[PDB]
Symmetry: C3
């Protein structure tokens, strides 16, 4: 028996008063689908003759192992965005412009403008502190081999007249010179000095100098003749003094050299030697001595003779004479 | 023919001894599903009258293009986590606190504590090396316009008596002064000096000074009168010396000024002029000269006369007399 | 009626000339599937007796909420890769090696090699600028408590003879000494000085010094005896001069001390005192005075007497005599 089932197009079914008997098959001609009547329900309400429940499907895809927008969105949210952040490269890029503690080269300038915790007294302060007590090198090497410059190598300046610290303080202990300035015979000489001092302060010596030499001078000066011409330097001196007036001045009465022992001293106050042998000096009591014949354009006020090698005085002479003339005058 | 098929609830089927003939339809009344008998298999083992194989489904979703947890987990694992890493901002945030080689402003302090490779002799060492041979600016500018300070602008100090380098070494070549200290007439003057030196070392001159001037003094001093009062500075001197004792001392015998030519010299050893004209001097042989009448509170030991303008000596006089008295005595 | 349907294996169906009548069921015996004839289409072209359209499935999975490779790939592309970027740690790791503006410790060296915008005149230049006008601390503290060192604490050097700036310039205003060097009595003394100057320049005083003291010397020297032995320092001097020759020299003619008032001065040019009381001096007109008896190994050229306390001259004496002898000669 070739059995054929009630049938019409889906849309036609979709509007049939036709109640399929229970378990009677009806057929959707334009789709080929079928449905079994429940004895009591319009065709468009019967379900299919076979399941359509995803659960019952063979060859299910693993949907479970697939990532979900949300899951993937949170997992992304923990991770940093390309620009919010610097490539290892831009990091170096910037880093290499910064000086390191271990050392570097400043092509630019290093201004310092200190806040001053305590300003740290005595050698654990100063904007630059340099402790070399465990190192064999220099503290601050500053040099130039330029031909001309517009400024000096180191300059110190204080602008307020109340300022009360030194510009340079040198507290030195060691076996060589505390401070050494050496100028080298130029090919080109100059008219300036190695150390030049200028003080406007009428209330304080431009340079003050104290020492406690056993066998040496507090200030020692040596003039080397710059040439081999013994007669070359006829005009150099070991020490030159000029007492002078204020530009636009009446004059000056300031003294030349002024020596003194406030404390008192047995030494020669002025001792002058040549070829390491005394030639003139002033004894501490103010007597003077000279190896060689002298001259006074002028007169010598002095005490009458007593010794034979004492100079005569008009008085002594006259009196010697006055005596002879008179004593002679057995011519009574 | 309205055909209806064997039928009972699924659960009822699920336990029927009823073997459906091959290709005979049976019907699950509570689900509407059907199944075809294979002539030999309990109903609950027949499959459906139509496929449920995901593969055969129309409107398949692209499951293939969906990301998978694993895939998405590895791809995430290559990407960096928000905090493990610094925002471009925190990067600057930190970076801007670091001094750069091109220059910056140190609001804080810069201690140096050197390790010392070699400690680098002669001008490619020192913790601070400053080469300005190609620049027209200063080396180290240090100034203050504060009114008071607790420390100096630069200080150098060495604490060990064996220390064997200078505190400041100045090797200078150029056309101006190697070192220049200038003090400016204060509104407020002080009692200190421009350059003050103090040495405790009894074995070395506090300041030693050598030069080879052709036509100039090794040490040159000029005293300017600070006022226009010619009689103002009655008490200044070009150079003042005080020879003095140790606080708590017997005395001192240390000399005042001590001059010498160890090598020997034809020059005036002491030459004193006024208005650029000789007034007193000591000849290199130790003869002295004076333009103006002099005085000795005291006596003058000297050699008998020879010239007419030589001073007389008690002896010479007496003998001249002794002669006349005697020669007169044609009074036989 | 047990109805059974046309049937053969799928593969057998798959090649049947058998046209199923419309809505007549045929059965795939090896699969259990069925199909309804459309009256006109070979069996292998009929579809199933029930849908296989993913859309119509109950228990649909949310495919919509699943992430897609592309979506997930772009969202990943915005996020940075682990190594392209530095962990907050490596960031510090590097950062901590860089000196900060607020302060740090340079274990290494800081060379400076300046480019020079303008080289900045007068106190807003120098590779190191240090302004302490608002701080109470030091400018540049450099010290060492090492025993020996190979270099100094600060050194300045200029290599070109045309160089035209100072090495150290000190423009000072304040109430204490501009520059202070102090050496402390060593346990170990040395033979060097506190300040040593050496100039090769025959065209410029090694040290030049100017000041305008009202009541003080431009250069003040004090020699303290280092011991309490009054007779200890028999050989120290306040100032020692040596005029000397060029190593390999004929001699020198350079003078010892050279004093002058170019401007002219009423002061004593040379005044020597002991226990703060004049003992010898040279009057500005070049007359000299001495408190104590003197001596000249030699002769004294001088002007005839006028006063009684003037020294006699051979001439004066002789003439006094020549007169008496002659005047006596009432012996006619
Ligand atoms: O007497 C001198 O002292 C210095 C130097 O030797 C001292 O460290 C020098 O060059 C002289 O001629
Ligand atoms: O005076 C100079 O210094 C160097 C060299 O002589 C250093 O001793 C040089 O070339 C000069 O002209
Ligand atoms: O002998 C010298 O003459 C000049 C100067 O005194 C001219 O007044 C000078 O510097 C000398 O050493
Ligand atoms: O003679 C002097 O030398 C200095 C300065 O001119 C030198 O560079 C100065 O101020 C003087 O009065
Ligand atoms: O002595 C001073 O320095 C400046 C100015 O005079 C600089 O020449 C100033 O105001 C002072 O009181
Ligand atoms: O003429 C002076 O008197 C004092 C001092 O010598 C007092 O002993 C001094 O410094 C002068 O220059
Ligand atoms: O007269 C002196 O000057 C210095 C110091 O007191 C000046 O700031 C010092 O130590 C002396 O003995
Ligand atoms: O000369 C020295 O300096 C210190 C201490 O005396 C400082 O006043 C020390 O231990 C020395 O040997
Ligand atoms: O009295 C002294 O003798 C030596 C020296 O003049 C030897 O020529 C010296 O330095 C002194 O102060």
């Amino acid at each position: 028996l070739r059995v054929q089932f009630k049938r019409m197009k889906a849309a036609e079914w979709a509007r049939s008063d036709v109640i399929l008997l229970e378990s009677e098959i009806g057929f959707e001609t334009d789709t080929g689908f079928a449905r079994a009547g429940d004895g009591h329900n319009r065709f468009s309400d019967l379900g299919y003759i076979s399941p359509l429940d995803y659960n019952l499907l063979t060859n299910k895809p693993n949907i479970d192992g697939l990532a979900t927008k949300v899951e993937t969105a949170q997992k992304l949210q923990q991770k940093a965005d390309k620009e919010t952040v610097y490539t290892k490269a831009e990091s170096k890029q910037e880093l290499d412009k910064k000086l390191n503690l271990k050392g570097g080269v400043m092509t630019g300038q290093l201004k310092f403008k200190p806040a001053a915790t305590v300003a740290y007294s005595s050698s654990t302060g100063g904007a630059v502190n340099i402790d070399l007590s465990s190192t064999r090198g220099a503290g601050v090497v500053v040099y130039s081999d330029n031909d001309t410059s517009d400024g000096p190598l180191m300059s110190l300046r204080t602008g307020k007249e109340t300022f009360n610290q030194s510009a340079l303080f040198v507290d030195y202990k060691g076996t060589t010179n505390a401070v050494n300035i050496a100028m080298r015979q130029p090919t080109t000489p100059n008219f300036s000095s190695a150390l030049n001092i200028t003080s406007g302060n009428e209330n304080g010596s431009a340079m003050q100098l104290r020492g406690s030499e056993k066998a040496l001078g507090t200030l020692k000066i040596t003039h080397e003749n710059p040439s081999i011409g013994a007669d070359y330097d006829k005009n150099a001196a070991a020490l030159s003094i000029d007492i002078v007036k204020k530009t636009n001045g009446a004059g000056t009465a300031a003294q030349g050299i002024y020596i003194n022992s406030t404390s008192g001293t047995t030494g020669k106050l002025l001792r002058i030697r040549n070829l390491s042998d005394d030639k003139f000096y002033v004894k501490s009591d103010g007597g003077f001595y000279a190896k060689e014949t002298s001259q006074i354009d002028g007169n010598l006020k002095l005490k009458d003779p007593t010794a034979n090698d004492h100079a005569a005085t008009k008085a002594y002479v006259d009196k010697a004479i006055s005596e002879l003339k008179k004593l002679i005058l057995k011519k009574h």
